């Protein structure tokens, strides 16, 4: 059975959506370490806009600290805090 | 303000599972050059998340098709809503990378 048009657009439109982020892509300055887990769930702007001209971007941003096993391989390793950017409010806005 | 997310709840929530993820139609279908689409983009269940070992990688096992209605526009020429099928990952698990 079809996912009805109205219900697509409504559900796609530019909102914050829980998204999984590999720590090492987001932070490549964490070169000495692997992380456990490798990856975290973060609220992040995603989705279509009315016009192909617009793009879906944050307006309010905030911090979530989390505890992350930090491993220097074959060496010391320790759970530690790590702070991450989360997008609380999104809106469609012009590209450049 | 807001308490730190406890390790248990990280791991549990990160681990390789299907997660609703938003996918540009033009990436999924790149042969569709003469059309824009409304939306630009659709919600599809897709494998995402950590694996215990940097050796493993998080991959689909069961896959399925989900038909959805999409405004198809040829610009300066208007349009037609029509059906369009999409790939969705129903079941994921961590498995070794040969890559």
UniProtKB/Swiss-Prot annotation, chain A:
Transmembrane segments: none annotated. Glycans are attached at residue 63. Signal peptide: none annotated. Induction: By hypoxia. Regulated by growth factors, cytokines, gonadotropins, nitric oxide, hypoglycemia and oncogenic mutations. Disulfide bonds join 14-56, 45-90, 49-92. Higher expression in pituitary tumors than the pituitary gland. Belongs to the PDGF/VEGF growth factor family. It is linked to Microvascular complications of diabetes 1: Pathological conditions that develop in numerous tissues and organs as a consequence of diabetes mellitus. They include diabetic retinopathy, diabetic nephropathy leading to end-stage renal disease, and diabetic neuropathy. Diabetic retinopathy remains the major cause of new-onset blindness among diabetic adults. It is characterized by vascular permeability and increased tissue ischemia and angiogenesis. This is Vascular endothelial growth factor A, long form. The gene is VEGFA. The chain holds residues 219 to 314 of 395 of the full protein.
């Amino acid at each position: 059975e079809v996912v009805k048009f109205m219900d697509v657009y409504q559900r796609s439109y530019c909102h914050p959506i829980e998204t999984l982020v590999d720590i090492f892509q987001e932070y490549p300055d964490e070169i000495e370490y692997i992380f456990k887990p490798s990856c975290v769930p973060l609220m992040r702007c995603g989705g279509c806009c009315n016009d192909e001209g617009l793009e879906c971007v944050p307006t309010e941003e905030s911090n979530i600290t989390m505890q992350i096993m930090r491993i220097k391989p074959h060496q010391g390793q320790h759970i530690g805090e790590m702070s991450f950017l989360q997008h609380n409010k999104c809106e469609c806005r012009p590209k450049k």
